Amino acid sequence: DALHDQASALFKPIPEQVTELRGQPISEQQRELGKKLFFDPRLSRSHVLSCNTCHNVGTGGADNVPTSVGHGWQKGPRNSPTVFNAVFNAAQFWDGRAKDLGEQAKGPIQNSVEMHSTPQLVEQTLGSIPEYVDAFRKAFPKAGKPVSFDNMALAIEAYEATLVTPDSPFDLYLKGDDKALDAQQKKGLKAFMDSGCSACHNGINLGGQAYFPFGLVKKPDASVLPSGDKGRFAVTKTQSDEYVFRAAPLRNVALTAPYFHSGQVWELKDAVAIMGNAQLGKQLAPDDVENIVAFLHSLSGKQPRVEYPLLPASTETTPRPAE
Amino acid sequence: DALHDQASALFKPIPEQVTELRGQPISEQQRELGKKLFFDPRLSRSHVLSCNTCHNVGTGGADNVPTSVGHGWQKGPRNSPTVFNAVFNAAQFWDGRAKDLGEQAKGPIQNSVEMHSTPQLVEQTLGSIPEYVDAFRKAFPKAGKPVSFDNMALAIEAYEATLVTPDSPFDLYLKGDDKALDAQQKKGLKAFMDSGCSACHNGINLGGQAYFPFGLVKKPDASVLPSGDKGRFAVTKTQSDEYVFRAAPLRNVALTAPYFHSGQVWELKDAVAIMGNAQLGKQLAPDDVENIVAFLHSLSGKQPRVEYPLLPASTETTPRPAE
Numbered sequence: 001d002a003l004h005d006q007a008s009a010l011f012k013p014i015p016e017q018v019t020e021l022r023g024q025p026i027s028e029q030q031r032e033l034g035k036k037l038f039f040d041p042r043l044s045r046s047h048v049l050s051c052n053t054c055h056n057v058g059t060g061g062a063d064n065v066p067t068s069v070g071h072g073w074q075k076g077p078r079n080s081p082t083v084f085n086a087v088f089n090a091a092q093f094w095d096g097r098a099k100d101l102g103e104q105a106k107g108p109i110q111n112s113v114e115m116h117s118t119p120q121l122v123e124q125t126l127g128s129i130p131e132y133v134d135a136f137r138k139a140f141p142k143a144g145k146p147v148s149f150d151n152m153a154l155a156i157e158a159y160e161a162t163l164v165t166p167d168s169p170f171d172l173y174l175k176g177d178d179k180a181l182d183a184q185q186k187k188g189l190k191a192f193m194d195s196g197c198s199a200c201h202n203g204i205n206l207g208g209q210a211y212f213p214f215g216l217v218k219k220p221d222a223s224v225l226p227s228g229d230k231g232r233f234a235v236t237k238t239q240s241d242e243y244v245f246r247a248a249p250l251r252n253v254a255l256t257a258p259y260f261h262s263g264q265v266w267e268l269k270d271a272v273a274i275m276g277n278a279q280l281g282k283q284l285a286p287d288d289v290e291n292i293v294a295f296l297h298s299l300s301g302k303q304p305r306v307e308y309p310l311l312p313a314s315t316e317t318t319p320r321p322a323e
Numbered sequence: 324d325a326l327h328d329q330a331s332a333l334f335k336p337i338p339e340q341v342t343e344l345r346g347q348p349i350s351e352q353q354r355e356l357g358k359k360l361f362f363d364p365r366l367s368r369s370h371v372l373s374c375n376t377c378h379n380v381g382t383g384g385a386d387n388v389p390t391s392v393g394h395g396w397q398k399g400p401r402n403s404p405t406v407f408n409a410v411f412n413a414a415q416f417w418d419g420r421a422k423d424l425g426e427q428a429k430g431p432i433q434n435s436v437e438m439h440s441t442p443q444l445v446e447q448t449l450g451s452i453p454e455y456v457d458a459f460r461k462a463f464p465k466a467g468k469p470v471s472f473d474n475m476a477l478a479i480e481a482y483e484a485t486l487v488t489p490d491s492p493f494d495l496y497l498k499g500d501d502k503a504l505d506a507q508q509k510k511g512l513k514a515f516m517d518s519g520c521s522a523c524h525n526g527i528n529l530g531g532q533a534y535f536p537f538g539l540v541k542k543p544d545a546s547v548l549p550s551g552d553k554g555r556f557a558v559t560k561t562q563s564d565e566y567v568f569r570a571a572p573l574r575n576v577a578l579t580a581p582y583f584h585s586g587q588v589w590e591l592k593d594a595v596a597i598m599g600n601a602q603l604g605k606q607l608a609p610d611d612v613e614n615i616v617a618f619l620h621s622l623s624g625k626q627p628r629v630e631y632p633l634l635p636a637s638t639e640t641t642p643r644p645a646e
């Protein structure tokens with residue numbers, strides 16, 4: 001039917017797995033090292049924060065707090081997005097300031113309000129542990145310096161690239177199952193398309209591919225759009241980039257409240273309404289709103305099964321937790 | 324041989340699993356619910372602390388920081404012990420104030436320097452998520468009030484009870500593999516028993532069953548025994564309990580540095596020496612110390628394989644992160 005044709009020209013399902021990146025097999029030695037690294041809180045200076053702290057794999061890959069709490073209980077400027085499906089995004093972070101997951105991982109380690117570490121500290125910590133030395137050596141066989149900050153970032157990337165959420169009701173619908181969307185979700189899917197939401201939220205991720213003003217038509221209030229965060233401007237210094245953000249990828253959006261970069265909006269219904277007004281100049285009917293919320297619930301996929309990694313013991317030369 | 328017979332008289336292996344508790348079967352449903360609760364940060368006021376935060380399953384079931392960092396980054400008075408094998412200990416906590424895991428679990432929830440929450444906030448939180456309501460109704464089918472604070476604690480205990488670490492090289496040895504300990508370990512074991520470490524550190528957990536002064540003979544250094552933490556004296560208000568702590572169970576001690584209730588001691592060789600002097604009045608020879616450290620490494624068991632739980636989404640009526 002028509003609705004199916006229309007959706008199929010706009011969206012793509014999440015693949016059942018990702019095993020390739022930039023045209024090469026993901027190394028599984030690298031995938032398994034990256035998994036240890038993602039959960040190792042010793043990548044942080046305090047030894048109390050891992051990537052999983054802010055990107056909890058049990059709660060949609062996000063920490064679901066307005067803005068993340070990092071080193072010294074410092075809350076950041078932004079809501080942490082999910083790491084799930086992040087490989088398919090055209091760039092990383094709310095302002096697209098990282099090309100890929102490899103480059104992205106370097107931010108958190110060094111960010112004083114997140115992990116508050118350095119390249120040297122990381123290298124020294126990982127190199128102090130024989131199991132890590134051996135795992136880096138094997139995962140990076142052509143390297144004269146297998147244990148390094150850049151290779152740590154590559155391993156984490158390899159792991160994250162695998163963290164995808166296939167077979168959401170919407171994907172099963174895309175792939176051929178007409179009844180995977182209930183009648184409400186089909187109305188919501190329709191409302192989403194016809195209102196123009198899909199102009200910014202399209203493809204594999206329903207967003208993450210381009211940057212737009214938060215307020216293409218009308219600026220949200222100052223709590224939803226804090227004046228102190230100019231988004232893309234901070235990257236490009238082009239003035240028309242003030243308050244321009246990456247279109248948020250909508251996969252698993254039901255699982256990652258609160259919403260927008262600012263984490264101020266707890267209800268999905270309110271996020272949908274704010275988006276009609278801000279981006280489309282359209283006050284959505286109560287029905288469109290509820291039906292779009294329903295459709296967004298169809299976006300939540302099979303959560304990846306994470307077996308908690310065993311991390312190797314610290315040794316005598318392992319740096320100690322500090323401030 | 325004689326060494327083996329001497330060891331069999333004082334020590335017992337960790338069982339392969341635990342399926343019973345207080346003469347009753349552990350319900351799978353309680354166990355599975357307990358795992359969800361153990362990992363759910365929404366049991367903390369801030370939504371950023373779970374049990375796993377301070378009792379990390381990846382790093383021996385302890386945070387491996389001197390004293391735990393909790394709500395608002397407040398450092399506690401004490402080092403967090405492992406939750407592994409904690410079921411076998413006569414009482415819980417360094418001062419034995421909780422009878423068992425169920426009673427223990429309520430402590431961290433309400434501790435201002437840890438989770439900073441309340442039974443009322445927990446119940447509001449669990450009651451607000453339909454998956455949790457259902458799961459309690461099925462886990463606690465004989466309760467007038469399935470979703471309760473008491474039941475939360477009983478669920479956590481049922482999960483924790485199952486986190487055991489069997490088949491450490493010591494336990495393989497006990498069970499009849501005479502080669503599971505190498506020659507240095509054999510010597511360490513011999514020194515351990517003969518010096519009288521085993522008077523306080525015995526049975527299943529090599530400790531955990533009885534309370535002794537830290538400094539039965541000589542008072543340790545005040546770095547290891549800060550004057551503001553008086554152990555059981557706070558529990559009982561009995562003067563003779565000043566600086567009395569539970570004999571530490573030694574299972575996985577190699578994996579859980581730093582050491583003692585205060586977490587000031589990062590090297591097991593230094594922990595062993597302090598124990599010798601303080602408890603036995605003996606300056607152990609560097610060689611005996613090296614050997615006993617090697618024996619202590621034999622107490623590292625097979626770590627539990629934990630599948631990270633999928634935690635159900637917050638709703639409109641789930642309490643928001645605060646302080």
Ligand code: HEC
Binds near residue numbers: 092094
């Ligand atoms: C350990 C090295 C990691 C890794 C691999 C990732 N994180 Fe974070 N994260 C946090 C916040 C607030 C953001 C958004 C900040 C901004 O946009 O300026 C992020 C962002 C990410 C991404 C981007 C994904 C996307 O869809 O844009 C990725 C892939 C990512 N992170 C991975 C918050 C935190 C923390 C708070 C204290 C910590 C710790 C981490 N992140 C750690 C890591």
Ligand code: HEC
Binds near residue numbers: 211213
């Ligand atoms: C571009 C002109 C857009 C159109 C039209 C719509 N959306 Fe959007 N969306 C866009 C951006 C640039 C952002 C990020 C804004 C920010 O700085 O936070 C978003 C975000 C959302 C969200 C929240 C996602 C999250 O926090 O993870 C939702 C729920 C959302 N958008 C939905 C939505 C709807 C329902 C729309 C049509 C009615 C719609 N968007 C249009 C870009 C654009």
Ligand code: HEC
Binds near residue numbers: 424
């Ligand atoms: C830090 C912010 C913690 C939180 C979160 C949790 N625990 Fe904890 N735990 C912590 C400390 C500092 C201590 C020792 C405190 C003392 O006065 O003795 C503990 C103790 C336990 C124990 C005792 C085990 C033993 O060998 O004595 C257990 C079984 C335990 N904690 C379990 C537990 C649970 C189930 C938690 C989630 C509700 C939890 N802890 C959180 C530090 C912190």
Ligand code: HEC
Binds near residue numbers: 518534
């Ligand atoms: C009773 C009189 C004891 C004898 C004899 C020995 N130990 Fe002990 N041990 C005892 C107590 C009361 C405690 C806890 C002290 C505190 O307040 O922290 C301990 C603790 C240990 C530890 C620390 C384990 C950890 O922090 O996880 C170790 C490594 C240890 N004990 C080893 C040990 C050795 C090698 C002994 C023979 C020299 C020895 N203990 C004797 C009680 C008693």
Ligand SMILES: [Ca+2]
Binds near residue numbers: 062258259260
């Ligand atoms: Ca969010």
Ligand SMILES: [Ca+2]
Binds near residue numbers: 385404580581
């Ligand atoms: Ca310890």
